[PDB]
Design a protein around this ligand. Structure first.
Ligand SMILES: OC[C@H]1O[C@@H](O[C@H]2[C@H](O)[C@@H](O)[C@H](O[C@H]3[C@H](O)[C@@H](O)[C@H](O[C@H]4[C@H](O)[C@@H](O)[C@H](O[C@H]5[C@H](O)[C@@H](O)[C@H](O)O[C@@H]5CO)O[C@@H]4CO)O[C@@H]3CO)O[C@@H]2CO)[C@H](O)[C@@H](O)[C@@H]1O
Length: 325
């Protein structure tokens, strides 16, 4: 009856729980209106997309609330997507039930056959993408993962996407060397704060996109051996979960100067080594450095325009390798 698109935990009979950016619930209903009850651990933001039209977003902040998603529609069958805009670090969310007024739930859409997993950091979270000032610091309201390069690429390809991304995370270090779990430590989890492990058999993508290393080179440059080994470890893990996946290793568009040259050198070394070792389904993609001609979001993170450029590039790369025309 309902599609739960993402890494969801179903252990609580009161309602499915999720954390990662871009987690979304998708359903068909008959009627004129729809409501949902949401519990949120922090300041999470959502958007309802109803018959293909995105509605003004709303937050549910460290509380449980019943929210009217849409109303006053022509009575009939409608398609609804409820999208978690904000990232896992802003808290787990539990969906406690829908209400359709005098209407009803209808058969759910067929799940998409094409599947992508994205693994990344602030760029894939779409940190700050609805801010237009690079001087402004992070606000949850301005983080719109629906307009991340990852979400846009998935819609371009008629694919579902799981967005396994955490702002500031790296392969060898987090932003500014702040201590914390690194990507390989969070990657195994459905709910990374509470230790609920993800069962990798539940979602086997044909494509994995990795965009990591910005935090490894934006302040103090990571050690080459350490970084290359860490990146290889991650690819090994992805390959062990998904023997048949095409893996796209991506650099850009936030790195600049020497940090960008070193990151490019190290990641292309990783890809070339995987290829020589016999894995021909590991590829490299570079998003050209943002130069200001497409503006900036909060803390210099990519604008929606820059996300759109990335999505055009990445869509064409995946179409090429997969034949996903
Ligand atoms: O609060 C939520 C979340 O925060 C995480 O930490 C955030 C941190 O709070 C931010 O301050 C930080 O922002 C920095 C970016 O990561 C970093 O990439 C960016 O670096 C700039 C650089 O400052 C700037 O000089 C550079 O300019 C270049 C131009 O882009 C080029 O065109 C030109 O040729 O060259 C110049 C430089 O010569 O641009 C780059 C980016 O392109 O600076 C930001 C700070 O100013 O981001 C962190 C990670 O998201 C924290 O980790 C979380 O735990 C926390 O929840």
């Amino acid at each position: 009856g309902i599609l739960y698109n993402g890494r969801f935990d179903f252990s609580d009979p009161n309602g499915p729980k999720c954390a990662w950016s871009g987690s979304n619930v998708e359903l068909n209903f008959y009627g004129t209106e729809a409501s949902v009850t949401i519990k949120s651990g922090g300041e999470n933001w959502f958007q309802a997309i109803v018959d293909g039209n995105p509605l003004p977003p709303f937050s549910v902040n460290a509380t449980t609330s019943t929210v009217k998603l849409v109303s006053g529609l022509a009575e009939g069958a409608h398609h609804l997507v409820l999208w978690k805009r904000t990232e896992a670090s802003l808290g787990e969310v539990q969906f406690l039930g829908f209400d359709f007024g005098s209407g009803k739930l209808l058969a759910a859409p067929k799940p998409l056959e094409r599947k992508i997993e994205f693994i990344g950091d602030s760029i894939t979270c779409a940190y700050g993408n609805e801010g237009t000032s690079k001087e402004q610091s992070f606000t949850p309201k301005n983080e719109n993962s629906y307009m991340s390069y990852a979400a846009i690429t998935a819609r371009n390809l008629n694919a579902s996407a799981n967005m396994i991304a955490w702002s500031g995370i790296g392969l060898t270090m987090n932003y500014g060397g702040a201590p914390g779990p690194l990507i390989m430590d969070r990657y195994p989890y459905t709910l990374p704060y509470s230790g609920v492990r993800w069962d990798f058999s539940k979602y086997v993508p044909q494509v994995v996109v990795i965009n990591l290393g910005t935090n490894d080179f934006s302040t103090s440059f990571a050690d080459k051996t350490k970084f290359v080994t860490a990146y290889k470890n991650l690819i090994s893990e992805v390959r062990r979960n998904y023997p048949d996946a095409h893996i796209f290793c991506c650099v850009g568009p936030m790195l600049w100067g020497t940090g960008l040259d070193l990151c490019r050198s190290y990641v292309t070394e990783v890809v070339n080594d995987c290829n020589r070792s016999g894995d021909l389904k590991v590829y490299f993609v570079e998003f050209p450095q943002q130069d200001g001609s497409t503006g900036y979001g909060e803390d210099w993170h990519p604008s929606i325009a820059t996300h759109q450029l990335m999505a055009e590039r990445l869509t064409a790369e995946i179409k090429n390798k997969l034949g996903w025309l």
